[PDB]
Amino acid sequence: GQKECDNALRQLETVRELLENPVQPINDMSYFGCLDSVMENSKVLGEAMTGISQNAKNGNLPEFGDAIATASKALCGFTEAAAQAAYLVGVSDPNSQAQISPEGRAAMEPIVISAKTMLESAGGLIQTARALAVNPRDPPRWSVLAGHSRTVSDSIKKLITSMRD
Amino acid sequence: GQKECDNALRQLETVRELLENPVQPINDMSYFGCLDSVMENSKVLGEAMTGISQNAKNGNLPEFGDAIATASKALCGFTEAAAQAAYLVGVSDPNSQAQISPEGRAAMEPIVISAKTMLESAGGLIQTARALAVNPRDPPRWSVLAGHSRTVSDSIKKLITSMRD
Amino acid sequence: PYFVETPYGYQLDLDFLKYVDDIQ
Amino acid sequence: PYFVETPYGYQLDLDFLKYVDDIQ
Numbered sequence: 001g002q003k004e005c006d007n008a009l010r011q012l013e014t015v016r017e018l019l020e021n022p023v024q025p026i027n028d029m030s031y032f033g034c035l036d037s038v039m040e041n042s043k044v045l046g047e048a049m050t051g052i053s054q055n056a057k058n059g060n061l062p063e064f065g066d067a068i069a070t071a072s073k074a075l076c077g078f079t080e081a082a083a084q085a086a087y088l089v090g091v092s093d094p095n096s097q098a099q100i101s102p103e104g105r106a107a108m109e110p111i112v113i114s115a116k117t118m119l120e121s122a123g124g125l126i127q128t129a130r131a132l133a134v135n136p137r138d139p140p141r142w143s144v145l146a147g148h149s150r151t152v153s154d155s156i157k158k159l160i161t162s163m164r165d
Numbered sequence: 166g167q168k169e170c171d172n173a174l175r176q177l178e179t180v181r182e183l184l185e186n187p188v189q190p191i192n193d194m195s196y197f198g199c200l201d202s203v204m205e206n207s208k209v210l211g212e213a214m215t216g217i218s219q220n221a222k223n224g225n226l227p228e229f230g231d232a233i234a235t236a237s238k239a240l241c242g243f244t245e246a247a248a249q250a251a252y253l254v255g256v257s258d259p260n261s262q263a264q265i266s267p268e269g270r271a272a273m274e275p276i277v278i279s280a281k282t283m284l285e286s287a288g289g290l291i292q293t294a295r296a297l298a299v300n301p302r303d304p305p306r307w308s309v310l311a312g313h314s315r316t317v318s319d320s321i322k323k324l325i326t327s328m329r330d
Numbered sequence: 331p332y333f334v335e336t337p338y339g340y341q342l343d344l345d346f347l348k349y350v351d352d353i354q
Numbered sequence: 355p356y357f358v359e360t361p362y363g364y365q366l367d368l369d370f371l372k373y374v375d376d377i378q
Contacts (some may be wrong), residue, residue, distance in 0.1 A: 001295070001298045001299065002295060005291050005292070005294070005295035005298075008291050009288060009291060009292070012284055012287065012288050012291075013288075015284070016281065016284050019277055019280050019281050019284070022273070022277070023265060025259035027259075028259055030257065031196045031197075031253075031257065032196075034328070035325075035328055035329075038324070038325060038328070039325075039374055039377075039378070042321055042325075042370060042371065042374055043371065043374065045321075046368050046370070046371040049290070049314060049317075049358075049366060049368065050358050050366070050368070052290075052291075052294050053294075053310070053358055053360050053366050054358070055298075056294055056297040056298045056301055057297075057301055057360065057361055059301070061298060064294075064298055068291065068294070071287070071291070072291075075283070075284065075287050078280075078283070079280050079283075079284060082276055082277075082279075082280035082324060083280070085276060085328055086273040086276040086277050086280070087273070088196075088257050089269070089272050089273040089276060089328075090265040090266070090269035090270050090272060090273040091256060091257065091263040091265055091269065092195065092196065092253050092256065092257065092269075093265070093266050093268055093269030093272055094190035094192075094193055095266035095267075095268050095269065096263055096264060096265050096266040096269045097263065097264045097266075098256040098261055098262065098263035098264070099261060099262045099263070100188060100255040100256055100258070100261050101255070101258050101260035101261040101262075102260075103258055103260050104254070104255035104256065104257075104258030104260065104261045105255050107254050107255060107258055108187070108251040108252070108254040108255040111247055111250060111251040111254060112184055112187070112247075112251050114247075115184050115243075115244050115247035115248070115251070116181065116184050118240070118243070118244075119177055119180070119181050119184070119240065119244060122177065122236070122240050123174060123177050123178075125214070125217075126170050126173050126174060126177075126217075126233065126236070126237075127170070127174070129170070129217050129218075129221055129229075129233070130166070130167060130170035132221040132222075133166045133170075133220075133221045133226060133229055134166065136221055136222055136224070136337065139337075139338040142336050142337055142338050142340045143338075143340050145218070145336065145340070145342070146336060146340035146341055146342060146343070149214060149342045149343045149344075150343040152214075152343070152346075153343040153344060153345050153346040154343075154346075156207055156210075156346040156349075157345065157346045157349045159203070159247060160200075160203060160204075160207075160346075160349065160350070160353070163199070163200055163203070163250055163254075164200075164353070204350055204353075204354070207346060207347065207350055208347065208350065211344050211346070211347040214334075214342060214344065215334050215342070215344070218334055218336050218342050219334070222336065222337055301361065304361075304362040307360050307361055307362050307364045308362075308364050310360065310364070310366070311360060311364035311365055311366060311367070314366045314367045314368075315367040317367070317370075318367040318368060318369050318370040319367075319370075321370040321373075322369065322370045322373045325370075325373065325374070325377070329377070
C-alpha cells in the first residue's frame with residue numbers, strides 16, 4: 001500500500017519540472033491535443049479519486065493501489081498537456097516573434113491551399129450568380145454555379161479537417 | 166444587383182492578400198477563436214448561398230443583394246480566421262523557435278499556476294490517503310482529504326477555463 | 331438543408347454544413 | 355457522480371467532472 005503512494009509522489013515531483021519553465025515544446029501535441037488530453041485525464045482522475053476514497057474506506061488495499069497508480073498516471077499526462085498548452089499560449093501571442101520551421105510551413109500549407117481554393121470558387125460562384133440574377137433562364141450557368149458550390153463545400157470541409165487534428 | 170456582386174468580388178481579392186504569406190499575427194484570435202470563427206461563418210455562408218440561389222431563381226433582387234453581401238462578409242471573416250490559424254499552426258510546430266513576449270508570459274501564467282496548484286493538492290491528497298489506507302478511523306484526515314480534493318477540483322476547473330478562451 | 335435544389339435539376343452543395351453539425 | 359460521500363460526512367469534490375460534462 002505504501003509503495004503505490006511512494007512511487008506516485010516520486011513521479012509527481014518529477015513531472016512538475018516541466019511546469020517550472022516551459023519555453024520549449026514538450027511533445028508533439030497540438031493545442032487541441034493538449035485540451036483533449038486534459039479532458040480525458042480529468043475523467044480518469046475523477047474515477048481514480050473515487051477509487052482512492054472508497055478502497056481506503058473499505059480496506060480494499062489491492063484496488064486502492066490500482067486507484068493510486070491510475071491517479072498518478074492521469075496527473076502526469078494532465079501536466080504534460082498543461083505544460084505544452086502553456087508553451088503554445090505564450091508563443092501564440094501576437095506580440096511574440098517566431099521563426100517558422102520547414103515542417104511548420106508544411107503543416108500550415110493544407111490550411112492555406114484550402115482557403116485560397118475557397119475564395120477562388122466562391123468568387124466564381126458570385127460571378128456566375130451575377131449573371132443568373134439578370135437572366136436565370138441559363139441552364140449551363142446553374143451547372144457552373146453548382147460546380148463552384150461543390151468546390152466551396154469541399155474546400156471548407158478540408159479546411160476544418162486540417163485544423164481539428 | 167451588379168453593385169453587390171462587384172463590391173463582393175473587390176473585397177474577396179483584397180482579403181486574399183492575407184493568405185499569400187501569413188508569417189505574422191493577423192488579429193488577436195486564439196486557435197479556438199479561429200476555429201469558432203470558421204464554424205460560425207460557415208453557418209452564415211450556408212444560408213447566404215441558399216439566399217443567393219433562391220433569390221436569383223425567384224427574381225427577388227433586393228434580397229439577392231442582401232445574400233450576396235452576407236456571403237461576402239462571411240467569406241472575409243472566414244479567411245481572417247484561416248490566415249491566423251495557418252500562422253498559429255506553423256508557429257506551434259515543435260521544430261520552430263519563438264521569442265515569447267511579456268504579454269505572452271502573462272497569458273500562460275494562469276495555466277502554469279493552476280497546474281502547479283493541482284500537483285501540490287493532489288500530492289497532499291495522496292499523502293493523506295496513504296495514512297487513511299492504513300487507518301481509516303481518522304476523521305480529521307478525511308477532512309484533509311476532502312480539502313485537497315476541493316483544491317484539486319478548483320484548480321482543474323480554472324485550468325480548463327484558462328485554455329478555452 | 332445539406333443541399334438546395336436549383337433550377338434545371340442541379341444541386342447547391344451544402345454538405346459542409348453537415349460536416350459542422352456532426353462535429354458539434 | 356459530481357461528489358463522493360466520504361466517512362464522517364465529508365465530501366470528495368468532483369465538480370470538475372460536472373464542468374467537463376457541461377462543456378461537452
